Amino acid sequence: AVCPDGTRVSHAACCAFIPLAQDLQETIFQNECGEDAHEVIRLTFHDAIAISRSQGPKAGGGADGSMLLFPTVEPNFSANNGIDDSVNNLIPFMQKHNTISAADLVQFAGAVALSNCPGAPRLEFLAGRPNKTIAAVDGLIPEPQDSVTKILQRFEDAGGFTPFEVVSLLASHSVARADKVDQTIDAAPFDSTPFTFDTQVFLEVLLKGVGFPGSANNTGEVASPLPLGSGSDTGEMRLQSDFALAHDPRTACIWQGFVNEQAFMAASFRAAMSKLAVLGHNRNSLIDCSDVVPVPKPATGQPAMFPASTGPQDLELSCPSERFPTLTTQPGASQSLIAHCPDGSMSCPGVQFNGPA
Ligand code: HEM
Ligand SMILES: *[C@@H]1O[C@H](CO)[C@@H](O[C@@H]2O[C@H](CO)[C@@H](O)[C@H](O)[C@H]2NC(C)=O)[C@H](O)[C@H]1NC(C)=O
Ligand SMILES: *[C@H]1O[C@H](CO)[C@@H](O)[C@H](O)[C@@H]1O
Ligand SMILES: [Ca+2]
Ligand SMILES: [Ca+2]
Ligand SMILES: [Ca+2]
Ligand code: NA
Asked: N or C: more exposed end of the chain, with fewer CB within 10 A?
């Protein structure tokens, strides 16, 4: 079909997603893999994973827009602390782009956001999820203090995910920061390149922790290998769950397998997201609108590298059967600050709408 703007696409039903992408980019992302992009990507996961095979449909409808349609319920669960900002940012689009379901909006926005992160895959995007659902129940969202057994169980119960798929999905922590885990600091990044969809998170979680970016006593957090911060350039934070996954026998080799393997990581993330984005639905009942997902920013193609102040002697390895790759180290004796802003600065306040969540 040919859309009003003259864009030729796969199906007429995909046309409305074009101005929605444009509005999202102009209004909240500005084509950056920044704060607002990060929060929406997190929302795609919190929306989708709230489903349970064993509990039945009454527990939650998966990728169903429930966070937007019931903004006062799930966003106030403690495991959803901080999700309100992303919900409040997407609700005005739901009201404006009113031929697109809340559920479709959430998944598509996540694909758009990810496209701004150099190295990310161009996600599959199927459309047609209904605009009516129920509020999910509490306890369906994995938490950083959770054990690996509990985490893997939750993912298997939600949609049959394998441990490979689970770790694949955690490539999103390559473009992720923490605002709620520590009450004193904000935007503590999970890797030294939170604006780049690279494999640094996999490497950096395997280094010996040497301090904390904030307090040493936060639930769900463990020591960080790069805790130095200054001004708004908060130090790296390490989640207990990421650390646990990197060292548990079930997932240690998969974790290490993404180190310095960009295309493998990206391809695996795309495959897992294909499954996550249609939880609560039969994919044979959704139309393919992948062609209206923006083309992602390409990676530079550079190998993963040890950040300054770290090196191979700092590795805590847990995969007996696979050789840890030979990597270079960025020159310098002391840790480099991790920039708060995509353009290297420390001042870049994102657009935030007030709302019901
Ligand atoms: C065992 C699984 C996981 C756990 C326990 C976990 C936990 C967390 C935690 C605690 C935060 C910090 C939130 C804050 O305090 O502001 C976070 C942020 C993030 N998560 Fe995860 N997560 C998991 C899986 C996922 C998955 C599967 C994705 C998406 C595909 C996702 C994407 C992100 C993003 C993008 C952020 C950054 C948000 C921002 O910087 O504003 N996470 N995660
Ligand atoms: C999906 O449901 C939401 C919530 O009922 C709808 O949102 C309303 O949209 C209209 C414009 O169409 C606004 O005037 C209302 O303020 C919105 N309500 C709320 C609670 O925000 C939305 O229109 C529906 N979308 C589709 C595709 O049917
Ligand atoms: C980042 O900054 C550190 C100093 O904090 C250097 O050691 C490194 O080489 C890079 O310039
Ligand atoms: Ca949901
Ligand atoms: Ca990164
Ligand atoms: Ca955030
Ligand atoms: Na709130």
From this structure: N
